[PDB]
Amino acid sequence: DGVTQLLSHIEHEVLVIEERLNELNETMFRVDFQPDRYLRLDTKKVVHESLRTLEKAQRQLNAARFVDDNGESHYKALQVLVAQLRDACERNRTLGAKALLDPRFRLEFAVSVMDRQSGNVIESRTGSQGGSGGEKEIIASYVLTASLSYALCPAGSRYPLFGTIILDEAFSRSSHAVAGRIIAALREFGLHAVFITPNKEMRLLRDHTRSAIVVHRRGQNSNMASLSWEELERHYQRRGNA
Amino acid sequence: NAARFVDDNGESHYKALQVLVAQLRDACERNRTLGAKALLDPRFRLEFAVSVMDRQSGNVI
Amino acid sequence: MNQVSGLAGKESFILTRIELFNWGGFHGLHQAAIHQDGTAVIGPTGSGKTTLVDALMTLLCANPRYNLASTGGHESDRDLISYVRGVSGPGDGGEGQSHIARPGKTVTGIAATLEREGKQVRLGALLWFDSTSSSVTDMKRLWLFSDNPGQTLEHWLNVYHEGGTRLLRQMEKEAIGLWTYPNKKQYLARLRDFFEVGENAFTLLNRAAGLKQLNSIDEIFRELVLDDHSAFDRAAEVANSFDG
Amino acid sequence: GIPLEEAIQSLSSILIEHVSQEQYDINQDNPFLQASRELREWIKRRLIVER
Amino acid sequence: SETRTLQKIREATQELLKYGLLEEASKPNLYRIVLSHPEEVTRILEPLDLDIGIDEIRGLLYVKVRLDETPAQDEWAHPLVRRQRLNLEQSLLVAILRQHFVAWEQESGTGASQAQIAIDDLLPQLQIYLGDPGSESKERTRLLTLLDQLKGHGLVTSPDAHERIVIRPIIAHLADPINLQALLAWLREQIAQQT
Amino acid sequence: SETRTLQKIREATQELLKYGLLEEASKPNLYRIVLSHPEEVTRILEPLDLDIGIDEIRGLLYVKVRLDETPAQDEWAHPLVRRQRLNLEQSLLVAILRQHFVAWEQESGTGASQAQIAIDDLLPQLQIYLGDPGSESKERTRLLTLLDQLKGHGLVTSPDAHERIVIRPIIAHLADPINLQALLAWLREQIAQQT
Amino acid sequence: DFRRVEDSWREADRALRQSIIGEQYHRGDIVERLLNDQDALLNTPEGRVFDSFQQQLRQSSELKAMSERLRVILSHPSASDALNRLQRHDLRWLVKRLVDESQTVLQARARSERDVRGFMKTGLAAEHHRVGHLLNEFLNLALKLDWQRQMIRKQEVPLPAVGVAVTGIPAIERLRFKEVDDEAEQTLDLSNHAADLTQIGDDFWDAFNGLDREVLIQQTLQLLAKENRPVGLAELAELLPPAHDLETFAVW
Ligand SMILES: Nc1ncnc2c1ncn2[C@@H]1O[C@H](COP(=O)(O)OP(=O)(O)O)[C@@H](O)[C@H]1O
Q: CA neighbours within 13 Å on the CB side: how many for E169?
A: 21
Distance A16 CA to ligand 1 centre (A): 38
Is there an atom of ligand 1 within 6 Å of C43 CB? no
What DSSP assignment string belongs to C12-73?
Answer: SBEEEEEEEEEETTEEEEEEEE--TT-EEEE-STTSSHHHHHHHHHHHH-SS--TTTTTSTT
The b-or-e profile of A6-26 (16+ CB within 10 A means b, else e) is bbebbeebbeebeebbeebbe
Torsion of CA G114, G115, G117, G118, to 10 degrees: 120
Distance CA A62, CA A77 (A): 9
Which run of H or E residues covers position F118? strand F116-118
Distance CA F73, CA A4 (A): 74
Instruction: Report whether E171 contacts E37 (CB < 8 A).
Output: no
Distance C88 CA to ligand 1 centre (A): 7
Instruction: Report whether F48 contacts E13 (CB < 8 A).
Output: yes
Provide the 8-state DSSP code for E184: H
Residue G48, classified by CB atoms within 10 Å of its CB into exposed (0-12), middle (13-18) or buried (19+), is middle
Distance CA A144, CA C204 (A): 9
Beta-carbon contacts of F40 under 8 Å, excluding residues fewer than 6 positions away, are F5, F6, F9
- Helix or strand or coil: residue F69? coil
Distance CA E162, CA E164 (A): 5
What DSSP assignment string belongs to chain A?
Answer: --SHHHHHHHHHHHHHHHHHHHHHHHHHTTS-SSTTT-EEEE------HHHHHHHHHHHHHHHHTT--SSSHHHHHHHHHHHHHHHHHHHTTTSHHHHHHH-GGGSS--EEEEE-SS--SEEEEESS-----HHHHHHHHHHHHHHHHHHHHSPTT-SS-SB-EEEEES--SSS-HHHHHHHHHHHHHTT-EEEEE--STTHHHHHTT-SEEEEEEE-SS-EEEEEEEHHHHHHHHHHHHT-
Instruction: Report whether A168 contacts C209 (CB < 8 A).
Output: yes
Beta-carbon contacts of C92 under 8 Å, excluding residues fewer than 6 positions away, are C99
Of F129, C20, C43, the C-alpha closest to A235 is C43
List the beta bridge partners of residue C141: C127
Of C134, G194, A231, the C-alpha closest to F131 is G194
C25–A89 C-beta distance less than 8 A: no
Q: In chain F, which among 22-51 make CB contacts under 8 A with chain E?
A: 44, 46-49
Q: In chain G, which among 148-187 make CB contacts under 8 A with chain C?
A: 183, 186-187
Distance C51 CA to ligand 1 centre (A): 6
Is there an atom of ligand 1 within 6 Å of C181 CB? no
Distance E128 CA to ligand 1 centre (A): 53
Residues in chain E: 195
Instruction: For residue G210, give the amino acid letter.
Output: G
The atom number, within ligand 1, closest to the CA of C79 reads 1
Q: CA neighbours within 13 Å on the CB side: how many for A31?
A: 24
Distance CA G121, CA E108 (A): 12
Resolution (A): 3.5
Distance CA F55, CA F61 (A): 6
Instruction: Report whether F52 contacts F34 (CB < 8 A).
Output: yes
Distance CA G153, CA E87 (A): 7
Q: How far is G8 from chain E (nearest CA, A)?
A: 15
Beta-carbon contacts of C133 under 8 Å, excluding residues fewer than 6 positions away, are none
Q: How far is C139 from chain G (nearest CA, A)?
A: 22
E174–G157 C-beta distance less than 8 A: no
Torsion of CA A69, A71, A73, A77, to 10 degrees: 170
Distance CA E44, CA C104 (A): 49
> Parallel, antiparallel, or unpaired: how do β-strands F60-65 and A164-168 relate?
unpaired
Which of C1, C3, C4, C12 to mutate to test binding with chain A, by most A CBs within 10 Å of its CB?
C12
What DSSP assignment string belongs to E129-144?
Answer: HH---SSHHHHHHHHH
Instruction: Report whether C139 contacts C80 (CB < 8 A).
Output: yes
Whole-angstrom CA distances from A235 to A232, E84, F61, G204 are 5, 49, 49, 12
Whole-angstrom CA distances from A191 to A36, A170, A213, C4, C204 are 21, 15, 19, 12, 14
Of C19, D35, C38, A107, the C-alpha closest to G190 is C19
Distance D29 CA to ligand 1 centre (A): 31
Distance C191 CA to ligand 1 centre (A): 28
Distance CA A101, CA A7 (A): 8
Picking from C38, C53, C88, the nearest residue to A193 by CB comes out as C38
Q: How many CB atoms lie within 10 A of CB A203?
A: 17
Of A188, A141, A138, the C-alpha closest to A32 is A188
Instruction: For residue G68, give the amino acid letter.
Output: E
Which of G178, G204, G208 to mutate to test binding with chain C, by most C CBs within 10 Å of its CB?
G204
Distance CA B40, CA C240 (A): 57
Q: How many CB atoms lie within 10 A of CB C117?
A: 9
Whole-angstrom CA distances from C214 to A133, A170, B36, C68, G89 are 10, 10, 65, 12, 66
Residues in chain A: 242
Distance CA G33, CA G87 (A): 46
Q: How far is F5 from chain G (nearest CA, A)?
A: 19
Is there an atom of ligand 1 within 6 Å of C72 CB? no
E partners (3+ CB pairs within 8 A) are A, B, C, D, F, G
E120–D37 C-beta distance less than 8 A: yes
Of E157, E121, D10, E161, the C-alpha closest to C185 is E161
The b-or-e profile of E32-62 (16+ CB within 10 A means b, else e) is ebbbebeebbeebbbbbbbbbbbbeebbbbb
Spell out the long-range contacts of G165-168 with Cβ–Cβ below 8 A and sequence spacing 24 or more: G165/E17, G165/E18, G165/E19, G165/E20, G165/E63, G165/E82, G165/E154, G166/E17, G166/E18, G166/E48, G166/E50, G166/E63, G166/E80, G166/F17, G166/F80, G167/E17, G167/E18, G167/F79, G167/F80, G167/F82, G168/F80, G168/F81, G168/F82
Q: Estimate the crossing angle of helix A49-64 against helix A4-28, to 10 degrees.
A: 130
Of A177, A223, A171, the C-alpha closest to A200 is A171
D36–E163 C-beta distance less than 8 A: yes
Q: CA neighbours within 13 Å on the CB side: how many for E20?
A: 21
The atom number, within ligand 1, closest to the CA of C52 reads 18
Instruction: Report whether C195 contacts A162 (CB < 8 A).
Output: yes
Beta-carbon contacts of C189 under 8 Å, excluding residues fewer than 6 positions away, are D29, D30
Q: Distance from CA of residue G219 to its chain's centroid?
A: 66
Distance C87 CA to ligand 1 centre (A): 9
Distance CA F186, CA F174 (A): 19
Q: Distance from CA of residue C84 to its chain's centroid?
A: 12
Question: Which chain D residue has the Cα nearest residue C232?
Answer: D20
Distance CA E123, CA E128 (A): 9
> Parallel, antiparallel, or unpaired: how do β-strands C39-42 and A211-217 relate?
parallel
Q: Distance from CA of residue G52 to its chain's centroid?
A: 45
- Helix or strand or coil: residue G27? coil
Q: How many CB atoms lie within 10 A of CB D34?
A: 20
Instruction: Report whether G41 contacts G9 (CB < 8 A).
Output: yes
Task: State residue C164 phi and psi, 5-degree precision.
Answer: 60, -150
Instruction: Report whether C194 contacts C187 (CB < 8 A).
Output: no
Distance CA F18, CA G217 (A): 66
Q: CA neighbours within 13 Å on the CB side: how many for G74?
A: 17
List the beta bridge partners of residue C179: C145
The atom number, within ligand 1, closest to the CA of C45 reads 21
Which of F132, F138, F140 to mutate to test binding with chain A, by most A CBs within 10 Å of its CB?
F138
**Experiment type:** cryo-EM
Q: Distance from CA of residue C95 to its chain's centroid?
A: 27
Distance A200 CA to ligand 1 centre (A): 19
Is there an atom of ligand 1 within 6 Å of C50 CB? yes
- Helix or strand or coil: residue C164? helix
Provide the 8-state DSSP code for F5: P
- According to DSSP H, which parts of chain F are helical? 7-19, 28-36, 38-45, 88-108, 119-130, 136-153, 177-194
A193 to chain C, any CB pair closer than 8 A? The answer is yes
Residue G200, classified by CB atoms within 10 Å of its CB into exposed (0-12), middle (13-18) or buried (19+), is buried
Rg (alpha carbons) of chain E, rounded to whole number:
19
E109–D36 C-beta distance less than 8 A: no
Which of E122, E137, E162 to mutate to test binding with chain D, by most D CBs within 10 Å of its CB?
E162
- Write out D18-38 in H/E/C secondary structure: CCCCCCCCCCCCCHHHHHHHH
Of F66, F14, F17, the C-alpha closest to G169 is F17
Q: How many CB atoms lie within 10 A of CB C67?
A: 19
Instruction: Report whether C62 contacts C199 (CB < 8 A).
Output: yes
Residue G228, classified by CB atoms within 10 Å of its CB into exposed (0-12), middle (13-18) or buried (19+), is exposed
Distance CA F46, CA E72 (A): 29
Instruction: Report whether D28 contacts D16 (CB < 8 A).
Output: yes
Within 8 A of C161 by CB-CB distance, chain G residues are: none
Q: Distance from CA of residue F118 to its chain's centroid?
A: 18
- Helix or strand or coil: residue F58? coil
- Write out chain B in H/E/C secondary structure: CCHHHCCCCCCHHHHHHHHHHHHHHHHHHCCCCHHHHHHHCHHHCCCCCCCCECCCCCCEC
Picking from C27, C42, C43, the nearest residue to G186 by CB comes out as C27
In degrees, rounded to 5, the angle at the alpha carbon of residue D15 between the alpha carbons of residues D14 and D17 is: 65
C27 to chain G, any CB pair closer than 8 A? The answer is yes
Question: Which chain B residue has the Cα nearest residue G135?
Answer: B6
Beta-carbon contacts of B30 under 8 Å, excluding residues fewer than 6 positions away, are B36
What DSSP assignment string belongs to E68-118?
Answer: SS-S-S-GGG-TT--S---BHHHHHHHHHHHHHHHHHHHT--SS----EEE
Q: Distance from CA of residue C210 to its chain's centroid?
A: 15
- Helix or strand or coil: residue G241? coil
Task: State residue G161 phi and psi, 5-degree precision.
Answer: -105, 105
Instruction: Report whether A112 contacts A101 (CB < 8 A).
Output: no
Of C125, C130, C109, the C-alpha closest to C20 is C109
Distance CA A140, CA A118 (A): 24
Of C113, C130, C123, the C-alpha closest to C190 is C123
Of A2, A107, A102, A15, the C-alpha closest to A61 is A2
Distance CA D43, CA E162 (A): 15
Is there an atom of ligand 1 within 6 Å of C26 CB? no
Which run of H or E residues covers position G49? helix G49-58
Whole-angstrom CA distances from E127 to B2, E140, E163, G219 are 10, 10, 18, 63
Rg (alpha carbons) of chain G, rounded to whole number:
46
Which of C50, C76, C110 to mutate for ligand 1's pocket (most ligand atoms within 8 Å of CB)? Answer: C50
Distance C15 CA to ligand 1 centre (A): 23
Task: State residue C147 phi and psi, 5-degree precision.
Answer: -115, -15
Task: List, edge to edge, every strand of the sheet that includes A164-168.
Answer: A164-168, A192-196, C39-42, A211-217, A222-228
Beta-carbon contacts of G221 under 8 Å, excluding residues fewer than 6 positions away, are none
Q: Distance from CA of residue A51 to its chain's centroid?
A: 24
Is there an atom of ligand 1 within 6 Å of C22 CB? no
The atom number, within ligand 1, closest to the CA of C83 reads 1
Q: How far is C188 from chain D (nearest CA, A)?
A: 10
Of A167, E62, E89, the C-alpha closest to C50 is A167
Instruction: Report whether C22 contacts C129 (CB < 8 A).
Output: no
Distance CA G10, CA G111 (A): 11
Q: In chain F, which among 127-186 make CB contacts under 8 A with chain A?
A: 134-135, 137-138
Instruction: Report whether G35 contacts G134 (CB < 8 A).
Output: no
E140–C196 C-beta distance less than 8 A: no
Question: Which chain G residue has the Cα nearest residue B13?
Answer: G136
Is there an atom of ligand 1 within 6 Å of C25 CB? yes
Picking from F20, F132, F180, the nearest residue to G177 by CB comes out as F180
Instruction: Report whether E31 contacts E23 (CB < 8 A).
Output: yes
Question: Which chain D residue has the Cα nearest residue C230?
Answer: D20
Instruction: Report whether A209 contacts C40 (CB < 8 A).
Output: yes
Distance C208 CA to ligand 1 centre (A): 19
Distance CA C58, CA F188 (A): 40
Task: State residue A102 phi and psi, 5-degree precision.
Answer: -125, 120
Is there an atom of ligand 1 within 6 Å of C165 CB? no
Q: How many CB atoms lie within 10 A of CB A56?
A: 12
Query: Are 3 or more Cβ–Cβ pairs between B and E shorter than 8 Å?
Result: yes
Distance CA G155, CA G137 (A): 19
Task: List, edge to edge, every strand of the sheet that includes E50-55.
Answer: E21-23, E60-65, E50-55
Distance CA C116, CA C15 (A): 9
B partners (3+ CB pairs within 8 A) are E, G
In degrees, rounded to 5, the angle at the alpha carbon of residue G239 between the alpha carbons of residues G234 and G242 is: 75
Residues in chain D: 51
Distance CA F68, CA A65 (A): 89
